[PDB]
Amino acid sequence: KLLRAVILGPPGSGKGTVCQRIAQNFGLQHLSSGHFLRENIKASTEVGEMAKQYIEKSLLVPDHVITRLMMSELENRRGQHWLLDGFPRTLGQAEALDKICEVDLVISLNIPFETLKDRLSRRWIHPPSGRVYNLDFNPPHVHGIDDVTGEPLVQQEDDKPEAVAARLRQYKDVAKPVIELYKSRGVLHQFSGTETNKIWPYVYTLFSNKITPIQSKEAYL
């Protein structure tokens, strides 16, 4: 009856964007830990003020605080369709979620490493300012130099294949137990394609199979 949907993927996969587009196209509310955290901190709720302290003191909000905050928000929404963006991250979080609902749909965006590494291979940066140029997207106005200063661009260590592969492995170590849990329940769709422009229709058809769209012309595209 009510859709319980989750979208997962590593940083830079496009899941925040796809979630928002799904939210507009299907009239779902975009639910994420980041969004509820900001809301709670802004409103100075009990969990909000804890979270604030975690960020200021340790630069990191513990998973159990995110869990607490999500479960309490989702409990105030049990009469609506849920689209969870990037939650559950960990297996304990998944176990908590399963106590409050039956998850019907999990999408994981598992873009091949070769594809992620190639996008990052044409990133150039102006170190002093942090200005970023992707040559296939937002190239500099003059080859090899910063738009503002005319100073040389460089390729940084964070975008090199070894740094990228290490971050990908860290993400998968955390994500794998959740993927396996939902894979076993028959609810899981993994995008592993090379054409990232196909992510949007791939996700869209999976929601169209569950719920009727609000017939926007902003689907294509």
UniProtKB/Swiss-Prot annotation:
Reaction equations catalysed: a ribonucleoside 5'-phosphate + ATP = a ribonucleoside 5'-diphosphate + ADP; AMP + ATP = 2 ADP; GTP + AMP = GDP + ADP; CMP + ATP = CDP + ADP
One Pfam family it belongs to: ADK_lid
Gene Ontology molecular-function annotations: adenylate kinase activity; ATP binding; CMP kinase activity; dCMP kinase activity; deoxyadenylate kinase activity; GTP binding; nucleoside diphosphate kinase activity; nucleoside monophosphate kinase activity
Induction statement: By hypoxia (at protein level).
Binding-site list for AMP: S33, R38, L59, L60, V61, G86, F87, P88, R89, Q93, R167
Database matches in Gene3D superfamilies: P-loop containing nucleotide triphosphate hydrolases (3.40.50.300)
NMP: annotated segments: 32-61
Region (LID): 122-159
Subunit organization: Monomer. Interacts with SLC25A5/ANT2.
Cited HAMAP family: Adenylate_kinase_Adk (MF_00235), Adenylate_kinase_AK3 (MF_03169), Adenylate_kinase_AK4 (MF_03170)
Family to which this protein belongs: Belongs to the adenylate kinase family. AK3 subfamily.
UniProt protein name: Adenylate kinase 4, mitochondrial
Gene label: AK4
